[PDB]
Amino acid sequence: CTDWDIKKYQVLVGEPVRIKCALLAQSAGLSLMWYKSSGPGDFEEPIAFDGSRMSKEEDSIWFRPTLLQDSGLYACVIRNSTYCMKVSISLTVGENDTGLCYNSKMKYFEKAELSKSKEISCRDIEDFLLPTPEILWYKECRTKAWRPSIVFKRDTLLIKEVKEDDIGNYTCELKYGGFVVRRTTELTVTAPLTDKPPKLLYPMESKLTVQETQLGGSANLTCRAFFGYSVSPLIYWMKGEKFIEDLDENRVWESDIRILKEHLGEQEVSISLIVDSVEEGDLGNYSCYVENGNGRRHASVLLHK
Amino acid sequence: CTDWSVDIKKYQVLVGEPVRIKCALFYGYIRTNYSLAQSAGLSLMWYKSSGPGDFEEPIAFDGSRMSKEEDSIWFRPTLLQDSGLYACVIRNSTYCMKVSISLTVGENDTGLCYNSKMKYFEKAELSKSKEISCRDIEDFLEILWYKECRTKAWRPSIVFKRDTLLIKEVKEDDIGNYTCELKYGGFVVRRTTELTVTAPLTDKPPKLLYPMESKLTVQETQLGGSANLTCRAFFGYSVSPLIYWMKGEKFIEDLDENRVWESDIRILKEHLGEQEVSISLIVDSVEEGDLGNYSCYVENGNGRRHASVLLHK
Ligand SMILES: *[C@@H]1O[C@H](CO)[C@@H](O[C@@H]2O[C@H](CO)[C@@H](O[C@@H]3O[C@H](CO[C@H]4O[C@H](CO)[C@@H](O)[C@H](O)[C@@H]4O)[C@@H](O)[C@H](O[C@H]4O[C@H](CO)[C@@H](O)[C@H](O)[C@@H]4O)[C@@H]3O)[C@H](O)[C@H]2NC(C)=O)[C@H](O)[C@H]1NC(C)=O
Ligand SMILES: *[C@@H]1O[C@H](CO)[C@@H](O[C@@H]2O[C@H](CO)[C@@H](O[C@@H]3O[C@H](CO[C@H]4O[C@H](CO)[C@@H](O)[C@H](O)[C@@H]4O)[C@@H](O)[C@H](O[C@H]4O[C@H](CO)[C@@H](O)[C@H](O)[C@@H]4O)[C@@H]3O)[C@H](O)[C@H]2NC(C)=O)[C@H](O)[C@H]1NC(C)=O
Ligand SMILES: *[C@@H]1O[C@H](CO)[C@@H](O[C@@H]2O[C@H](CO)[C@@H](O[C@@H]3O[C@H](CO[C@H]4O[C@H](CO)[C@@H](O)[C@H](O)[C@@H]4O)[C@@H](O)[C@H](O[C@H]4O[C@H](CO)[C@@H](O)[C@H](O)[C@@H]4O)[C@@H]3O)[C@H](O)[C@H]2NC(C)=O)[C@H](O)[C@H]1NC(C)=O
Ligand SMILES: *[C@@H]1O[C@H](CO)[C@@H](O[C@@H]2O[C@H](CO)[C@@H](O[C@@H]3O[C@H](CO)[C@@H](O)[C@H](O[C@H]4O[C@H](CO)[C@@H](O)[C@H](O)[C@@H]4O)[C@@H]3O)[C@H](O)[C@H]2NC(C)=O)[C@H](O)[C@H]1NC(C)=O
Ligand SMILES: *[C@@H]1O[C@H](CO)[C@@H](O[C@@H]2O[C@H](CO)[C@@H](O[C@@H]3O[C@H](CO)[C@@H](O)[C@H](O)[C@@H]3O)[C@H](O)[C@H]2NC(C)=O)[C@H](O)[C@H]1NC(C)=O
Ligand SMILES: *[C@@H]1O[C@H](CO)[C@@H](O[C@@H]2O[C@H](CO)[C@@H](O[C@@H]3O[C@H](CO)[C@@H](O)[C@H](O)[C@@H]3O)[C@H](O)[C@H]2NC(C)=O)[C@H](O)[C@H]1NC(C)=O
Ligand SMILES: *[C@@H]1O[C@H](CO)[C@@H](O)[C@H](O)[C@H]1NC(C)=O
């Protein structure tokens, strides 16, 4: 039968899951089958349904609860006299690690700006909603008394003003017929957006630094700048109108950008310009260009002797 | 900059073994090499996010273990921390591209040499040859093979050739996890594969068990009653089993009463790829028209067999 899934399932052992065949079928005479492979290339064993945990319900399989055994590839096949279709679903079951409520490999991630609003939502909770709903939030796998600044509405968490204290793993809990559904997200805070172009440190914008090199010598011109949080940092060297790529590719080349420091999204990167076997043409005024969202700044270096 | 969400290539390694993460942009996406691209002034940076939504911190290498060598990153050895998403970015005045590579690091579980989630899989036919190879090994260029995480003396049926394991005749006993080991400068490289043996190709069409091919079984039902007609067959290894009910020329879908429907296929047994499935035909509020001869059709690659059932009373 025709063969091809992007949808992947991650769940903690002891939590209810619903796996759907990605593709009225009973009416058309179509017969539906599932296979568990547990790996790419495996036997794809036919599943004989029990009634306690694994339930064949409509277009889906229900696990109540899930077990470590359940981890694997699930292939849903539809069969007819002349018609067939099948698709494979990946289910990974893991256990919360050592006293924690969640699994390290299995969690969501978010980023927030200091002194700014941020919303945290309980994602992928649709399959347990009826009739048309209670949720509890944990901080570092512990119950907390939440400040009035933080507001809870309908499966979501809102922080009106975000502080450097509000960092870590946020896990929401749902009750599903004597079962718990946990979705955990980790928040990382960064400094707010710059609103200002980066700052040149070496060379400075208005000092006109001087570099001395002898002919047939080696020249190292190293720019340095500070990039506040705002894409990779854009810092590069130019000699007048000519870009680094244009001038004499055999003797002169540009180094890769280095990260001298990083904190809260702010970086202090440095890049260097290297010239070998320096000649009369190489001597002149070199400028380090630094650019971002709000501006383009540059400073100059003089090559002498 | 222009983005390629996630690279198909993913890395799975045991903690304490060497890994090499390759920037996909130089090998697959773009033909131009790192040595010639950098000449054009392109700058390369890496980021470690550990998640699709995380901060993506810029990594300052500065390490004995983590080495920025050309278009790749070297881990010698790898650590449990290293698990995450690695994004390589190329920078220009007006040009940018980035791609993300997934590295997953795990530890051998409870007295075992391997990780259950991280291993290869294979299938073999009984009494036939099958070769097991040490896959995706390179950048570390002799091999030694273990069976069930133990050193073994191998029969002349099993032969060793560089980077491969060959079994002339596969037997039902030689099933399980085969792990090859390589030594790379005081480090060990383990690649483990699991073998599952199945019965050889049928060469014969399936066999009807219930009803039998030439007995013409009879079921008695009263009018306004309930009818359960359950077929049963044996399918040897050869895809889902093709077994279905028919009433004369008409398929089950054709008569399409709200009263008569077909059940889903059930798996009564499984051994070595051989199945003995059963399907049932159900009729509710039986009427005079429903009475007649029903046939259960069973089919596979080499043949089509069928048996008949008579509905009476
Ligand atoms: C028309 O009539 C047919 C009868 O031919 C009905 O089909 C039967 O439906 C019943 C449903 O109750 C089936 O009963 C099931 O038996 C399965 C087989 O047993 C397992 O155990 C042995 C070991 O002894 C294994 O070797 C074997 O491979 C099986 O795995 C069970 O798996 C079923 O589920 C569970 O049952 C008990 C319930 O407490 C659990 O404790 C068990 O752990 C088990 O998981 C179930 O018991 C019966 O097999 C069917 N027969 C056939 C021939 O298909 C149709 O349903 C009916 N049509 C209707 C009503 O529309
Ligand atoms: C939920 O959110 C919390 C924070 O809100 C996260 O906490 C971090 O958890 C990780 C583990 O996943 C911690 O990493 C581990 O802890 C060690 C502590 O680091 C400090 O160590 C000493 C004090 O003991 C300090 O002096 C030092 O400056 C460090 O700040 C790490 O150092 C460990 O790595 C070390 O060990 C390995 C092997 O032993 C070595 O090879 C390494 O080189 C390294 O030395 C270890 O990885 C991390 O520290 C926690 N952060 C904080 C701030 O406490 C949770 O991770 C998060 N939940 C999940 C699932 O991620
Ligand atoms: C190649 O490598 C793979 C993977 O490493 C091996 O697959 C293993 O196969 C063995 C079979 O010999 C499996 O062993 C079995 O473990 C099961 C554990 O389940 C228990 O726990 C769950 C909850 O987590 C319960 O639901 C369940 O009822 C069990 O309690 C059990 O089915 C068996 O363990 C025995 O221990 C329990 C106590 O826990 C006893 O009460 C029972 O009597 C029971 O017999 C069974 O032994 C093992 O789990 C498989 N591993 C994985 C990861 O799937 C291959 O075997 C290996 N190849 C070769 C040739 O060895
Ligand atoms: C051109 O000039 C630039 C700037 O002057 C220069 O950049 C320098 O690069 C080197 C490495 O390529 C840096 O040296 C390292 O700095 C970091 C600390 O941030 C550490 O990794 C190292 O510290 C120790 O390293 C050794 C152990 O690995 C120790 O033995 C050693 O004693 C150190 O303690 C190492 O110092 C250097 O920091 C920068 N320069 C600046 C100012 O940051 C570049 O290399 C020059 N040449 C080119 C581009 O060809
Ligand atoms: C996070 O993971 C840990 C371990 O991975 C989970 O701990 C487990 O907790 C259950 C219930 O408390 C334990 O089962 C019970 O064990 C006691 C032992 O006396 C027994 O009397 C009970 O009848 C029941 O069987 C289980 O042993 C324990 N697992 C361990 C210790 O390895 C924990 O539940 C997970 N979730 C969290 C912390 O939210
Ligand atoms: C980074 O630098 C600039 C900014 O966009 C780009 O410059 C030019 O890009 C073109 C197409 O990518 C390059 O094509 C070449 O054209 C020459 C023409 O003589 C031809 O001989 C080559 O075979 C090739 O087709 C061109 O070299 C390049 N010019 C430069 C770098 O000076 C560049 O493409 C950007 N991106 C990179 C380098 O990946
Ligand atoms: C399992 O990993 C440990 C390191 O945590 C190592 O010492 C041990 O040798 C490994 N097992 C085998 C069979 O090599």
Side-chain angles (χ1 to χ4, degrees):
Chain A
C1 296
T2 94
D3 194 346
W4 325 79
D5 187 86
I6 315 107
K7 195 92 197 301
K8 305 189 162 174
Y9 290 85
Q10 286 151 65
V11 69
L12 286 179
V13 44
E15 304 187 347
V17 216
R18 186 238 268 224
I19 307 301
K20 289 174 65 160
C21 191
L23 293 218
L24 86 313
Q26 178 182 349
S27 319
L30 294 163
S31 185
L32 196 146
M33 287 268 303
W34 294 85
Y35 292 94
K36 175 180 183 185
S37 342
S38 83
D42 208 43
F43 167 62
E44 247 165 30
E45 193 167 37
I47 38 109
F49 277 96
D50 193 282
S52 55
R53 282 191 330 109
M54 275 202 251
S55 183
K56 175 188 286 174
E57 294 190 25
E58 315 306 275
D59 48 325
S60 41
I61 303 187
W62 271 97
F63 297 83
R64 326 168 189 256
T66 180
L67 254 52
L68 257 188
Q69 288 80 83
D70 293 343
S71 303
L73 278 181
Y74 288 76
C76 170
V77 193
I78 326 187
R79 257 300 247 271
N80 214 17
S81 301
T82 51
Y83 186 31
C84 172
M85 276 300 177
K86 79 174 267 175
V87 71
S88 275
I89 304 122
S90 157
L91 167 82
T92 305
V93 178
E95 37 179 17
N96 59 281
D97 41 321
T98 317
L100 281 181
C101 52
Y102 49 69
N103 199 268
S104 300
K105 298 191 190 276
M106 305 157 40
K107 59 173 164 165
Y108 301 78
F109 295 96
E110 278 275 6
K111 45 172 62 265
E113 260 178 89
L114 284 179
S115 299
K116 297 231 197 172
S117 49
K118 178 54 173 185
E119 185 189 72
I120 290 305
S121 304
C122 205
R123 294 166 53 85
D124 289 322
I125 203 181
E126 69 271 334
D127 296 335
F128 315 104
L129 238 298
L130 29 69
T132 188
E134 63 84 43
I135 300 205
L136 294 181
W137 287 91
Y138 298 82
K139 221 284 194 174
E140 303 312 316
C141 288
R142 226 122 50 176
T143 314
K144 291 287 198 305
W146 302 86
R147 334 161 308 188
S149 177
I150 287 176
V151 180
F152 298 92
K153 157 103 188 320
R154 196 164 265 164
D155 80 59
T156 72
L157 183 149
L158 172 62
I159 313 186
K160 303 195 291 222
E161 200 201 76
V162 149
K163 319 181 165 171
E164 203 183 315
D165 211 276
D166 307 336
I167 309 179
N169 318 280
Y170 293 71
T171 148
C172 62
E173 212 196 46
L174 173 68
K175 203 90 169 186
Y176 188 68
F179 285 115
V180 287
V181 183
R182 300 184 173 145
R183 309 268 168 268
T184 164
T185 143
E186 160 160 5
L187 228 182
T188 4
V189 301
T190 59
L193 302 177
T194 41
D195 195 85
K196 272 292 170 183
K199 247 96 177 169
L200 276 302
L201 312 177
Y202 210 143
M204 302 218 65
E205 249 189 309
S206 292
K207 288 294 290 189
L208 191 54
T209 322
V210 181
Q211 268 252 14
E212 251 82 20
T213 52
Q214 51 182 100
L215 301 187
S218 140
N220 182 338
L221 307 162
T222 302
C223 192
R224 185 202 308 170
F226 169 83
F227 286 80
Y229 181 67
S230 62
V231 291
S232 171
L234 232 191
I235 171 182
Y236 58 97
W237 279 95
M238 210 176 322
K239 175 181 184 300
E241 91 270 29
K242 307 249 154 176
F243 286 103
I244 175 65
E245 52 213 67
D246 310 312
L247 28 94
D248 200 11
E249 290 273 49
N250 282 6
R251 308 192 281 94
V252 47
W253 49 279
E254 210 176 348
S255 80
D256 285 324
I257 309 195
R258 308 172 183 101
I259 326 292
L260 298 200
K261 92 149 190 160
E262 196 283 320
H263 199 51
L264 293 197
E266 296 186 337
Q267 299 166 30
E268 185 181 300
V269 298
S270 65
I271 193 166
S272 26
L273 212 183
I274 307 298
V275 186
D276 296 334
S277 167
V278 177
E279 65 184 13
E280 195 81 52
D282 298 347
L283 308 159
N285 212 256
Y286 291 82
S287 315
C288 188
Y289 284 80
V290 160
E291 188 181 339
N292 78 327
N294 359 74
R296 198 228 292 281
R297 293 202 214 272
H298 66 277
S300 310
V301 177
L302 194 271
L303 203 65
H304 198 213
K305 289 285 200 61
Chain B
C1 296
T2 108
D3 194 346
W4 323 78
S5 295
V6 147
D7 186 28
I8 315 107
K9 195 92 196 59
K10 304 190 162 61
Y11 291 85
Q12 286 150 65
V13 276
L14 287 179
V15 45
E17 79 186 348
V19 210
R20 165 139 109 86
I21 303 192
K22 291 169 65 160
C23 192
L25 293 174
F26 292 114
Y27 294 94
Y29 295 101
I30 271 73
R31 277 96 73 181
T32 338
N33 319 125
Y34 171 78
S35 294
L36 325 176
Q38 179 181 349
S39 318
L42 294 164
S43 185
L44 194 67
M45 287 137 296
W46 294 84
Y47 293 93
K48 175 180 183 185
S49 49
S50 83
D54 208 42
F55 167 63
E56 247 165 30
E57 193 167 37
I59 46 112
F61 282 93
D62 298 326
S64 307
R65 282 188 328 109
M66 274 201 251
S67 301
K68 177 186 191 172
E69 294 189 25
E70 314 306 275
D71 47 76
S72 41
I73 303 187
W74 269 97
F75 297 83
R76 38 233 303 187
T78 186
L79 188 57
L80 258 188
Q81 287 187 351
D82 294 343
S83 303
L85 279 181
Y86 288 76
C88 60
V89 192
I90 330 187
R91 256 300 192 181
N92 217 348
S93 181
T94 51
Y95 184 94
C96 172
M97 275 188 172
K98 79 175 267 175
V99 71
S100 275
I101 302 94
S102 157
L103 167 82
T104 306
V105 179
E107 36 180 17
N108 57 2
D109 41 25
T110 317
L112 281 181
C113 55
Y114 53 72
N115 200 267
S116 299
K117 298 191 190 276
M118 306 157 192
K119 58 174 164 166
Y120 300 78
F121 296 97
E122 278 275 6
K123 66 172 63 178
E125 260 179 39
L126 229 179
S127 72
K128 297 233 197 73
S129 49
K130 177 53 62 185
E131 184 190 305
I132 284 78
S133 175
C134 204
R135 292 168 50 84
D136 289 323
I137 204 287
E138 69 270 334
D139 298 335
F140 314 108
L141 296 175
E142 61 84 43
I143 6 80
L144 39 179
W145 287 90
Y146 295 172
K147 221 284 194 60
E148 302 311 316
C149 290
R150 286 162 47 217
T151 315
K152 190 184 178 181
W154 300 84
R155 58 178 178 267
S157 178
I158 281 76
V159 289
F160 294 163
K161 186 178 185 178
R162 190 165 261 167
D163 105 88
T164 69
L165 183 147
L166 172 61
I167 312 186
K168 304 194 293 222
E169 298 174 73
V170 146
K171 320 180 166 170
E172 203 182 315
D173 287 340
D174 41 81
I175 168 182
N177 314 278
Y178 294 71
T179 150
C180 61
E181 212 196 46
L182 172 67
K183 204 179 230 65
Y184 188 68
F187 285 114
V188 287
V189 183
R190 300 183 174 144
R191 309 268 168 268
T192 146
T193 92
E194 160 160 5
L195 225 190
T196 49
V197 187
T198 185
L201 303 177
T202 41
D203 118 287
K204 274 163 187 175
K207 247 96 177 169
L208 275 302
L209 313 177
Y210 235 146
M212 301 129 293
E213 249 188 309
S214 291
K215 289 293 290 189
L216 195 309
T217 69
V218 181
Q219 234 255 15
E220 329 104 31
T221 313
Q222 51 184 321
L223 301 187
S226 56
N228 181 338
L229 307 162
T230 302
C231 192
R232 185 200 308 170
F234 168 82
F235 286 81
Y237 180 66
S238 178
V239 291
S240 171
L242 224 197
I243 171 182
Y244 58 97
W245 279 95
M246 210 176 322
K247 175 181 184 58
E249 90 270 29
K250 308 251 154 176
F251 288 103
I252 308 302
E253 52 213 68
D254 309 314
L255 16 145
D256 200 11
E257 290 152 17
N258 282 6
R259 308 189 279 93
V260 50
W261 43 278
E262 210 175 348
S263 79
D264 202 335
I265 309 195
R266 308 172 183 101
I267 326 292
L268 297 200
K269 92 149 190 160
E270 195 283 319
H271 198 211
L272 293 196
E274 296 185 337
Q275 299 165 128
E276 186 243 295
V277 298
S278 65
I279 192 166
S280 182
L281 212 182
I282 310 297
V283 186
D284 296 334
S285 167
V286 178
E287 66 183 13
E288 195 80 52
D290 298 346
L291 308 159
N293 211 256
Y294 292 90
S295 315
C296 189
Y297 281 79
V298 159
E299 189 181 339
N300 78 327
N302 6 81
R304 198 228 292 281
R305 293 202 214 272
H306 67 105
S308 311
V309 176
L310 194 271
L311 203 65
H312 199 54
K313 289 284 298 175

